[PDB]
């Protein structure tokens, strides 16, 4: 069960900063992070 | 092992258009929405 919103639960599982990070990592992975960083 | 990292290569592992999703589906819930961010 690896739904989208499965996933969703996930992040408001963790706190802000843990999720920060996570997103962080795929800002700079990803290289997309232009939309007010 | 449910790490960070491991979930960075699970957002690799799908496609763009269900990373959409995702990404459009923690945007409403969370409403993380501070005008294109």
């Not at 408001?12 to 962080?24: N, P, R, T």
Request: hydrophobic share 60%; proline share 0%; glycine share 2%.
């Amino acid at each position: 069960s690896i739904t989208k919103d499965q996933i969703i639960e996930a992040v408001a599982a963790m706190s802000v900063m843990d999720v920060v990070e996570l997103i962080s990592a795929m800002e700079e992975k990803f290289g997309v992070s232009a939309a007010a960083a």
